[PDB]
Design a protein around this nucleic acid. Structure first.
Lengths: 69, 177, 210, 115
RNA sequence: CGGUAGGGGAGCGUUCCGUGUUAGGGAGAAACGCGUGCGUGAGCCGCGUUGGACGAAGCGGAAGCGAGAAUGUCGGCUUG
RNA sequence: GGCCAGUGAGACGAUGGGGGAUAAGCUUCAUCGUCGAGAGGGAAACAGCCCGGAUCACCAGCUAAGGCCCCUAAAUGACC
RNA sequence: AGACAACCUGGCGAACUGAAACAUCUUAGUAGCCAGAGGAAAAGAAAGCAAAAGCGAUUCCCGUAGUAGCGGCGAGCGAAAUGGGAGCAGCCUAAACCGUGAAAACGGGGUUGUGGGAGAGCAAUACAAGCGUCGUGCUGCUAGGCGAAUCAGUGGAGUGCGGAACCCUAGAUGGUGAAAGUCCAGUAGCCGAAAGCAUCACUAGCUUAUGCUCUGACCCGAGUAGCAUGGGGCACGUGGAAUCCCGUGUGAAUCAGCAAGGACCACCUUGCAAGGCUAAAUACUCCUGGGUGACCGAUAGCGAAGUAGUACCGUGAGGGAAGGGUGAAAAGAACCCCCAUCGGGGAGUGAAAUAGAACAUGAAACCGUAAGCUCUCAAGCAGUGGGAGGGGGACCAGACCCUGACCGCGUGCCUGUUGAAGAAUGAGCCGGCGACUCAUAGGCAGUGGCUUGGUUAAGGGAACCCACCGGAGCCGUAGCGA
């Protein structure tokens, strides 16, 4: 019948890492980079966990990716 | 067991709660949806992932890198098999190890790609019992384990790429010792 | 485990023919065979039921009277479901579902039903039939001599389905013949009295071993 | 799979039979039979707690009116002064009952409260 | 051990189905009306100079499953 | 943490203030009490004030707030 | 020619909607309109997929897969290849060449792809298969035929109950005063067609036809492909934009070639466009013939159980109802009285006449009549607690039921608010109809089945369900990085 469709606008932003947790790329990097600090530009260059609110929001908005909790 | 005396265990089948059948039932009246709003009205309601007019969670985050470029994603090109899959197996001292051996034994069950990704033997775990492996290429540590066990190790060349005769000529010119 | 006598047209106690099946564990049995039964007679069902919703009836798709200036409700259809002239809400669509039950749970349901069938003197046992002139009198006479009433709803099944017992057995209501081609659970869990043959007790031990 | 029923009429006929002697459309008319069942039962609640309270009040004023027949200024409070000093544990205002069912015996009660 | 919005646990009832061509039933079933009975209650059980052929319980399942509201709606009958 | 809801209109009273005219049962905040979601008693009646937190029964007793001439239960109580 | 419910093809072709606005997009090439046509239609026999390994026309199902992608990279849209099944079937034509005719045609030849065909020469004969008015053949259908086995007692009637017997190749069903294996029609089984239709098997007969060597010359579908533009559609919204088809304009090569393999070039691989035709699997019901139903039972089920698309409304397009059940058998009331009828009472039929034609059970609102208690100095959401007086049957006679002198207390119910007796909303009343439901997926919880990891989908099956196959796929086994 009707399969659920994977939301592509968040599948390109979120990712599972083996143990089963959503990670994400930090924002504020491809715009006005001289104005910032190198401390900021490698603070905003790493991928981190998403917090539990929007870890449980998009877990049902992106169904086919095997995330526990 | 007769047709009479059969009955399910408790907890196996709960009753589906019916809504709007009385306030003593639990979800009477507004059927458990408060008073008003989009959560009480009938229809599709709210898109999941929508922040109420705020720019959402997914739009404020930049796209993942190769998925931003549209580059083809990282994809497994072999079957990763450790030596822990080989010791716990019932392979005895005289036994061949190949694709159909690991399929027919009960270690790998490959279905989606029987055609593309052959095999690879990795390093974690030991292998005390010697064998005769004719499978695809190895890691350096797994070559150290299998050559440390004194077993017959054989790499298998899978496919031959098509090299153009001027590229094969330019590469055959490079044989200058 | 427990033996059982092999009867005939005479009725001696020759042979053993042990019935060793794959039983369900205790406290877990009646939920398993209840589950296989309830999907047997749930899967036996069919759609066969229909009703016309608001979008199908030949009632009006018009506004019968305007929105205001009339002391009467806002009724915008004559085939509205609030009005008993047609149109229903949430009635039965003709649904042809698929309730799948596991194989080795259903085989264990059959093995638990036949496993609980024997032991409480509900199984006597035959081995052969040779019925020239099939006429249902030696059938009900052998049925009487084996200790089975024709009205007490017995059931029994035979290998290879010889035609002269299908011909002499299909008229009495209380029993119907089966075969390993057509061995169900609901027809065999009537469980009043039920017999086997040697090809069915050794086919039945051949399949549901240990 | 039509499901026309009769259970609203037994559900409703029981409440119909409870609402007898309600003087008019409170005893005949269903959409008021319900709320008279309801209001009759809460009337039974508050009039039960206040029948405990109300009979307490009635026995207080009844034994007060019994004690005040002496003429000399002996109130109801002084009857409890010398009803608990002379150790009589909890006659429970049923001396307001034998104060009229046995007036010589309540005269023996009070005339032994004096001594 | 008060309780609105709300959450969880446990149950009653209805029509159909398996047992079921069930027990029972023109020696009166269902209905309709009745109770000095029993339950926390949804309800059960019992009685009927009414009615005239169906249909329990138990163990289970499935719902067009439960009414006092929608200027609801369809019939009947009031008020003035 | 997992699953899964509502709520996001508050109101008055005391204190701390701003707006006002130190006017509003006015408006906005900060801590608290009640109502909301709280029955009963006192307040004549009367959401927010005081006592007080209702599982149920009793034709039981003792009390808090508050009262003891009559309506309406208890002192036409005592002494300044 | 006209008609045809739905499916199918071709053309015109939206908009409300979703994006929380909206224009790109979606809804959607859906609805609608027109045309055509058959029981199926379309497509269909590689100028094809694929990737150095291979498959062999088209269609449909499971799967890959909600993957690769596409997209104000928003809302959303979403393949294909590998794999597993259902069903299988391939054939005619143009050109080069000979012959007749001023061409245009005609008759032979040839229609193929790790290339053929034409031209020249050598051999060689019959195996197999295709098509088919025609009539003998077969089964099936459109009429039907034979077809087993019991009485008696019971309150109207027996099929139910109790007592005595039997059939079964028949105990499916419908009816018969009442429920049936033995009462009837039937059924199981055995039979049966003058005539027509259909199913495959004969037949006078037409046909398909063969192998080798040389020969790059001659041919292999031209205003066509390609290109510059304007686009459409392939999941792909002009993007690197390929494949496919069109509008204007330019405009090739024949096999030593041309096209495709996701701009394009080189090599290789694959195929041979610019010519047509084909059954099957496949989708649906205005229907037809069988079998079913945890489908309905007169507010339901078709709108329609009678005049049903009827009465009625509208100029018209069109909208659109409602009304079932006396009995088993009318046995439907002879006759007498009231009397102009309608109706009523006797009598008669019936088991029932309180089953009388408004006729089956008949509830509530509503209207009444009779019996018990009680109201005309009385303020009240009509109650409730206490209960004066009175009445009724009674047996655990103290109990139970009905009435209510008087006192205390008590601001209808829902909605929905900070707050509703509210003079905020709603309902004249009574009875019915009337609302978190269904399909498919993700996630979690609870109960199971296996852990020699688990489980099948499509599909096959004694008509369906089903035993048993069917390991395709899916999930967990390895992660990190773009």
């Amino acid at each position: 019948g009707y399969k659920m469709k994977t939301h592509k606008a968040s599948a390109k932003r979120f990712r599972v890492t083996g143990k089963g947790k959503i990670v994400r790329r930090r924002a504020g990097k491809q715009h006005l980079l001289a104005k910032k600090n190198t401390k900021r530009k490698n603070r905003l260059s790493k991928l981190i966990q998403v917090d539990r609110s929007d870890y449980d929001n998009v877990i049902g908005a992106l169904p086919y990716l095997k995330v526990n909790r | 067991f007769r047709l009479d005396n059969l009955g399910p265990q408790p907890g196996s089948r709960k009753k589906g709660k019916r809504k709007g059948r009385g306030h003593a039932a639990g979800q009477g009246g507004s059927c458990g949806f408060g008073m008003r709003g989009q959560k009480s009205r009938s229809g599709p309601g709210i898109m999941r992932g929508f922040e109420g007019g705020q720019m959402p969670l997914y739009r404020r985050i930049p796209k993942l890198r190769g998925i931003a470029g549209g580059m083809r994603a990282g994809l497994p090109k072999y079957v990763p098999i450790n030596l822990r899959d080989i010791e716990v197996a019932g392979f005895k001292e005289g036994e061949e190890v190949s694709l159909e051996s690991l399929k027919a034994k009960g270690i790998i069950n490959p279905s989606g790609r029987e055609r593309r990704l052959p095999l690879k033997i990795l390093g974690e775990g030991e292998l005390s019992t010697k064998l005769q492996i004719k499978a695809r290429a190895f890691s350096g540590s797994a070559k150290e384990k299998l050559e440390a066990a004194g077993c017959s190790v054989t790499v298998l060349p899978g496919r031959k790429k098509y090299i153009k005769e001027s590229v094969r000529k330019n590469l055959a010119r490079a044989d200058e010792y | 485990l427990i033996p059982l006598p092999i009867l005939n047209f005479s009725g001696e106690k020759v042979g053993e023919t042990f019935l060793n099946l794959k039983t369900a564990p205790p406290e877990k049995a009646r939920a398993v065979v209840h589950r296989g039964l309830i999907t047997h007679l749930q899967n036996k069902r069919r759609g066969t039921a229909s009703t016309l919703t608001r979008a199908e009836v030949r009632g009006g798709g018009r506004k019968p009277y305007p929105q205001k200036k009339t002391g009467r409700a806002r009724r915008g259809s004559q085939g509205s479901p609030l009005r008993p002239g047609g149109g229903v809400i949430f009635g039965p669509k003709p649904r042809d579902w698929t309730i799948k039950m596991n194989k080795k749970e259903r085989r264990l349901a059959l093995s638990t039903a036949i496993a609980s069938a024997v032991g409480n003197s509900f199984v006597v046992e035959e081995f052969a039939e040779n019925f020239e002139k099939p006429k249902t009198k030696d059938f009900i006479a052998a049925m009487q001599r084996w200790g089975l009433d024709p009205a007490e709803k017995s059931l029994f099944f035979l290998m290879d389905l010889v035609e002269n017992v299908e011909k002499s057995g299909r008229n009495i209501r209380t029993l119907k013949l089966l075969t390993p081609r057509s061995l169900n659970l609901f027809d065999v869990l009537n469980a009043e009295k039920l017999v086997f043959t040697e090809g069915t007790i050794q086919y039945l031990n051949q399949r549901y071993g240990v | 799979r039509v499901k026309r029923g009769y259970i609203a009429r037994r559900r409703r006929k029981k409440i119909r039979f409870f609402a007898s002697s309600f003087r008019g459309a409170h005893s005949r008319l269903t959409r008021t039979i319900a709320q008279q069942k309801i209001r009759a039962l809460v009337s039974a609640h508050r009039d039960r707690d206040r029948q405990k309270r109300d009979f307490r009040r009635l026995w207080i004023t009844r034994i007060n009116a019994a004690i005040r027949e002496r003429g000399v200024y002996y109130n109801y409070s002084k009857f409890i002064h010398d009803l608990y000093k002379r150790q009589l544990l909890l006659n429970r205002k049923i001396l307001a009952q034998i104060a009229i069912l046995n007036p010589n015996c309540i005269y023996m009660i009070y005339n032994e409260i004096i001594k």
